[PDB]
Write an enzyme that holds these catalytic residues in place. Structure first.
Site, PDB file in Angstrom:
ATOM      1  N   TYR C 282       0.827  -1.201   0.000  1.00  0.00           N
ATOM      2  CA  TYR C 282       0.000   0.000   0.000  1.00  0.00           C
ATOM      3  C   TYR C 282       0.861   1.250   0.000  1.00  0.00           C
ATOM      4  O   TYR C 282       1.755   1.418   0.841  1.00  0.00           O
ATOM      5  CB  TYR C 282      -0.897  -0.021   1.227  1.00  0.00           C
ATOM      6  CG  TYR C 282      -2.141   0.850   1.166  1.00  0.00           C
ATOM      7  CD1 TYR C 282      -2.089   2.205   1.470  1.00  0.00           C
ATOM      8  CD2 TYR C 282      -3.373   0.277   0.902  1.00  0.00           C
ATOM      9  CE1 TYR C 282      -3.263   2.967   1.487  1.00  0.00           C
ATOM     10  CE2 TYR C 282      -4.532   1.017   0.915  1.00  0.00           C
ATOM     11  CZ  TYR C 282      -4.475   2.355   1.219  1.00  0.00           C
ATOM     12  OH  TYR C 282      -5.646   3.078   1.227  1.00  0.00           O
ATOM     13  N   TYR C 332      -6.257   5.299  -6.756  1.00  0.00           N
ATOM     14  CA  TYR C 332      -6.440   5.253  -5.302  1.00  0.00           C
ATOM     15  C   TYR C 332      -7.853   4.746  -5.011  1.00  0.00           C
ATOM     16  O   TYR C 332      -8.776   5.516  -4.761  1.00  0.00           O
ATOM     17  CB  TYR C 332      -6.208   6.635  -4.706  1.00  0.00           C
ATOM     18  CG  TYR C 332      -6.187   6.742  -3.193  1.00  0.00           C
ATOM     19  CD1 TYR C 332      -5.740   5.700  -2.382  1.00  0.00           C
ATOM     20  CD2 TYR C 332      -6.598   7.913  -2.587  1.00  0.00           C
ATOM     21  CE1 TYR C 332      -5.710   5.847  -0.983  1.00  0.00           C
ATOM     22  CE2 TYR C 332      -6.568   8.070  -1.209  1.00  0.00           C
ATOM     23  CZ  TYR C 332      -6.115   7.028  -0.418  1.00  0.00           C
ATOM     24  OH  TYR C 332      -6.074   7.201   0.944  1.00  0.00           O
TER      25      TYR C 332
END
Ligand SMILES: [Cl-]
Ligand SMILES: [Cl-]
Ligand SMILES: [Cl-]
Ligand SMILES: [Cl-]
Ligand SMILES: [Cl-]
Ligand SMILES: [Cl-]
Ligand SMILES: [Cl-]
Ligand code: NA
Ligand code: NA
Ligand SMILES: [Zn+2]
Ligand SMILES: [Zn+2]
Lengths: 382, 127, 382, 131
Positions: C282, C332
């Site tokens: 991430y 995102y």
């Protein structure tokens, strides 16, 4: 990863239930959580999971850092308000059964009585309600209740009998708001209209308080202080064309199909039939939906809950002792969580209104919403 | 002003024109209400509308007594109306005393001005 | 038994853009239907839905729009993108325990084009906003500056993460930065946002939706794609955990909650770091990629800068990383699109497939209670 | 701006209005805790009091905000994570020093900012004046 019977409730903890706690929601949560942990004979550092409702403002990390629970391996939410209560315990049991967590606390705490009151789908759903003044839960329920009356001939006195038995049980419960304050059916019928066909005494009040529950493996629970309350069934249900309190567009709207779906799973998981249920804790923030719950769960025929109730079956000496703490209507409205605690007490033998030995207790969560239920029972053996 | 977003604005825009509409899948022609971007029967995201005939029956109803609502004289009635087309709709029910309402009674569409920027369908007895 | 019991059989996504032109619910429905079709299933097969607490397209709105109908499982995981891998853990748990057979995990929003109470979550902002510490970039920067101090990492070390992300995004037609690679010089010349973070250390917001279909491994074997088995699935929240601002621990330069995720992933799966053939780390901000590598055991404490400078995140290196371009380079979608890329790597269908990959480790959001997965090729031939 | 104050953090902002920087403390086991909360994680007591900080600490970490503009601040501005002598840490602004002169570990001392007629906040300045 066998689920039925793998986990048990070993601890229950609550603040007092009040109309003005004088303290924060987080403090209420922490008090109930620590009480439940102590009730289970455990320490905060033993806890590795936390489960609550989407709307609870005391997030898992805040509870954990205040109480000394520390690290977590499991933290989840279930939505749709009180519909979530039994689902929180399902979550915990699933985490225990799969080895994700060993000790899970399920909690809810709020100041709903004293606390001061976007473009997504949840917000947009209100477009069908607020412009027409259909803006309260009592009104959302009333729309169902009126149709149930039409189809089955139930009357306001049939709903009143639920309030009466709730308040009879609350009257002997020192933790209940309406301790020592029973009502008659005449009181119910004399109480003012809120939204027809609901009187004031068909509606529960808001509460301040916190409730928590400690879930562990059945093996671990056998070493803890209380009789284990085994989780023999734990289920969620959301029906076809489900809405938030307003599923008015189904072919029939007088049942609660999502609760029937919960019940089907509870009975299949537990190996039980309705006749095996020793007591029922039936979610009762409003009285009328208690009647279709009894039908969805197989305790009586469609349309005949009024007769089941009139025959006295919900009394402490009846064939389905019900809401022995007083319910959400009589004890406190902690969005169903305090009902689960009473079910634990019934299995333990420690209800204030204990009807004798109780082997299996069925608990339901919020009605009108995606919902949940449990069957809790005595240890079937070691 | 209601909770309007891209998926229900069409209905309130039509209500502004005094047209009561029902969303419909453009592919399989199945009606749906409350509305949404997708057809649950065939999966199509293509949709249009049909205008309601303006008739229906009272399927259920409530009578609100207490506590007071600011935008309404108390008591007022909210009805769940089953349209002839087969969908249902929550609206107010006017032109009849609350104790005279009967489940199943025929109603016809009328239009309520409510604020000068919001027009809403209402139902009243066929007569 | 949880590890290996469930698998991802379907992935589905909308286009990722800066203006979807449609509702968050429509995006959710599109992605969910696409994932269902990808798994060779029908909407009526779905009996579970999992999303994030903040997702506005509730399970019931998705279900009644798509024809999923009834549900036996519906849950949320909180803390924003920390939740991404947790949603898949939820689904795997429901499958392993028999609560659900077909679970869809989803997230959809218009974060690029789209537009406080008395509780503990609101009150946490009192330590931040009065001082102007009001953005996620700043919250991350506070950790990054201390990591630089303790280990001698520099801005260029963080920049190498951005460069490799953008290198992989540049060959990904689905990525926002398709055909637009950067140099380390580009990164260093980009304006400061909050020291030590440049503009190119920060991902942009996106409109779009992502969905994932989870079934039993046995079921997945009869569906169209190579199953991506869920060999590890874990959540983690650390001692004294805060939401993006755990600044009060003895040491703040690691990510203890990601270490806790990793410990569970390796124990569940029976694997070591050496068995991991690719990583989806991430990367909404670059700097916390470095402590992630250390927490997960791929290099020693403080030596991620050396692991990265040696080329190990490249397609030909020891740990091919973010082969879709990451949150920074592709989109995102709060980590969910990274899980999809991990599935492609297991299937062999990544646009930047680094050869055959047996096991892929995926992490969720950093700075928050978080989660991870190990997805693996089917371990038949036992 | 008005901080997000509830029953569990009001004491700290009330002390700040009196120009006292305080740290919450368990009244039973005397363990400090910050950020505050209603319970002690070490012993479980809900009884607490406060200690007044000495007003000294060190820059433990910091950020320098350059972009985008914040309305209430001249850009760039500094937020520090200050480690107080008492051992807890505190997020606050660091005033009186050019960003490029900040060093991790540098000693800082308490000052007070009237963010508005309604809100007084603790901030830190270098122990060594920057001239
Ligand atoms: Cl409700
Ligand atoms: Cl009356
Ligand atoms: Cl009206
Ligand atoms: Cl520059
Ligand atoms: Cl510790
Ligand atoms: Cl290498
Ligand atoms: Cl604030
Ligand atoms: Na713990
Ligand atoms: Na279904
Ligand atoms: Zn269709
Ligand atoms: Zn203490």
């Amino acid at each position: 990863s066998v689920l039925p019977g793998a986990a048990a409730i070993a601890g229950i903890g609550a603040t007092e239930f009040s109309k003005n706690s004088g303290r924060s929601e987080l403090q209420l949560a922490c008090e109930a959580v620590l009480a439940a942990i102590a009730d289970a004979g455990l320490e905060p550092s033993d806890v590795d999971g936390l489960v609550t409702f989407t709307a609870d403002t005391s997030s898992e990390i805040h509870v954990a850092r205040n109480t000394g629970i520390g690290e977590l391996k499991f933290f989840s939410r279930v939505g749709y308000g009180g519909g979530a209560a039994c689902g929180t315990v399902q979550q915990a049991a699933m985490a225990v059964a799969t080895g994700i967590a060993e000790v899970v606390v399920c909690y809810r705490a709020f100041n709903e009585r004293s606390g001061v009151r976007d473009q997504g789908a949840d917000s947009a759903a209100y477009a069908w309600l607020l412009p027409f003044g259909l803006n309260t839960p009592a009104q959302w329920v009333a729309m169902f209740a009126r149709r149930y009356m039409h189809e089955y001939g139930a009357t306001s006195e049939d709903f009143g009998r639920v309030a009466v038995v709730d308040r009879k049980h609350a009257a002997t419960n020192p933790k209940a708001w309406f301790y020592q304050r029973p009502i008659t059916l005449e009181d119910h019928q004399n109480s003012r209209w809120i939204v027809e066909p609901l009187h004031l005494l068909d509606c529960c009040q808001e509460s301040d308080g916190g409730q928590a529950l400690v879930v562990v493996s059945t093996e671990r629970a056998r070493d803890l202080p209380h009789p284990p309350a085994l989780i023999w069934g734990a289920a969620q249900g959301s029906g076809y064309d489900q809405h938030m309190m307003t599923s008015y567009y189904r072919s029939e709207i007088t049942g609660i199909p999502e609760m029937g779906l919960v019940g089907q799973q509870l009975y299949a998981q537990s190996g039980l039939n309705p006749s095996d249920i020793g007591a029922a804790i039936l979610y009762d923030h409003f009285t009328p939906l208690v009647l279709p719950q009894l039908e969805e769960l197989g305790f009586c025929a469609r349309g005949e809950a009024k007769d089941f109730i009139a025959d006295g079956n919900l009394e402490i000496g009846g064939r389905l002792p019900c809401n022995t703490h007083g319910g959400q209507l009589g004890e406190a409205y902690i969005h169903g969580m305090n009902g689960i605690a009473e079910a634990v007490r019934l299995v333990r033998g420690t209800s204030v209104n204990q009807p004798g030995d109780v082997t299996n207790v069925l608990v339901t969560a919020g009605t009108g919403v995606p919902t949940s239920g449990l069957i809790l029972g005595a240890d079937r053996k070691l | 002003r209601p909770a309007i977003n891209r998926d229900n604005a069409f209905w309130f825009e039509a209500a502004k024109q005094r047209r009561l509409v029902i969303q419909r899948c453009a592919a399989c022609k199945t009606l749906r209400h409350p509305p949404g971007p997708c057809c649950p029967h065939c999966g199509s995201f293509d949709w249009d509308t049909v205008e309601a005939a303006g008739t229906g029956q009272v399927y259920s109803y409530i009578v609100a007594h207490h506590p007071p609502h600011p935008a309404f004289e108390m008591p007022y009635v909210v009805a769940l109306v089953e349209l002839t087309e087969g969908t249902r709709l929550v609206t107010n029910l006017v032109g009849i005393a609350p104790d005279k309402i009967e489940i199943g009674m025929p109603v016809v569409l009328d239009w309520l001005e409510a604020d000068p920027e919001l027009t809403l369908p209402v139902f009243r007895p066929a007569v």
